[PDB]
């Protein structure tokens, strides 16, 4: 039971659009809570820009109604950002880069009560040993969620999400054959990923209180 030709076409489309980076020059800037926050918001803005570009290329996305396209993008932005962060946390980066990124996020006005779950979730993801295909598919599945608020046509979204889940199930069998619970483990992490919507909203209101200002794109997608 390998991938069918239409599944191979679907997977390649997802892969090509996913591999089109958030980290420019983190290093060129000084370390202090103010600069760490600005770097953080600059990387989150870059991530939203690449998310919109990936989303508009998902097969069938352009066929959906304009309002449902916006509901899917706003509803997924925070989860997709935590998933991408978990991918980067587990990415083999040069000697120091991960440590600088990690140190910047710990000194950016975020309470350690959010940092603890965040990094626990990130460590939990790395133990799964996901391939670039698993991260690309999981992102597409997160974006094409039929249970987001303000979707007028939910069956249309489910029709797009369904083939992606079928592909992910098959990849788990191919790439993780000794762990038959791997697919169920990935969907368990999606459930854990949804808890960050609440945590993010809390971090946002703490930043607002300390008069932090966000970039125009983050203001629109996060409703700040």
């Amino acid at each position: 039971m390998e991938l069918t030709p239409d599944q191979q076409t679907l997977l390649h489309f997802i892969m090509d659009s996913y591999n089109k980076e958030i980290t420019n020059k983190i290093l060129k800037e000084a370390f202090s809570a103010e600069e760490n926050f600005l770097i953080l918001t600059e990387m989150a803005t870059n991530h939203v820009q690449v998310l919109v570009e990936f989303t508009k290329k998902l097969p069938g996305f352009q066929t959906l109604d304009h309002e449902d396209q916006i509901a899917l993008l706003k509803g997924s932005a925070v989860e997709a950002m935590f998933l991408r962060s978990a991918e980067i946390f587990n990415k083999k980066l040069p000697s120091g880069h991960s440590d600088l990124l990690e140190a910047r996020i710990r000194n950016s006005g975020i309470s350690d009560e959010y940092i603890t779950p965040m990094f626990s979730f990130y460590k939990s993801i790395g133990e799964l040993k996901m391939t670039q295909e698993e991260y690309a598919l999981l992102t597409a599945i997160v974006i094409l969620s039929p249970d987001r608020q303000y979707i007028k046509d939910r069956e249309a979204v489910e029709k797009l999400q369904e083939p992606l889940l079928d592909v992910l199930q098959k990849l788990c069998k191919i790439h993780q054959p000794e762990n038959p619970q791997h697919f169920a483990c990935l969907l368990g992490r999606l459930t854990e990923l949804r808890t960050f919507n609440h945590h993010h909203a809390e971090m946002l209101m703490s930043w607002r209180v300390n008069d932090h200002k966000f970039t125009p794109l983050l203001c629109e997608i996060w409703d700040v």
Binding site: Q49, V52, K56, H66, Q69, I70, L73, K74, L217, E220
Partner: peptide
């Protein structure tokens, strides 16, 4: 809103 619609189109 407008910025998201601009980026989507």
């Amino acid at each position: 809103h407008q910025l998201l619609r601009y980026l989507l189109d």
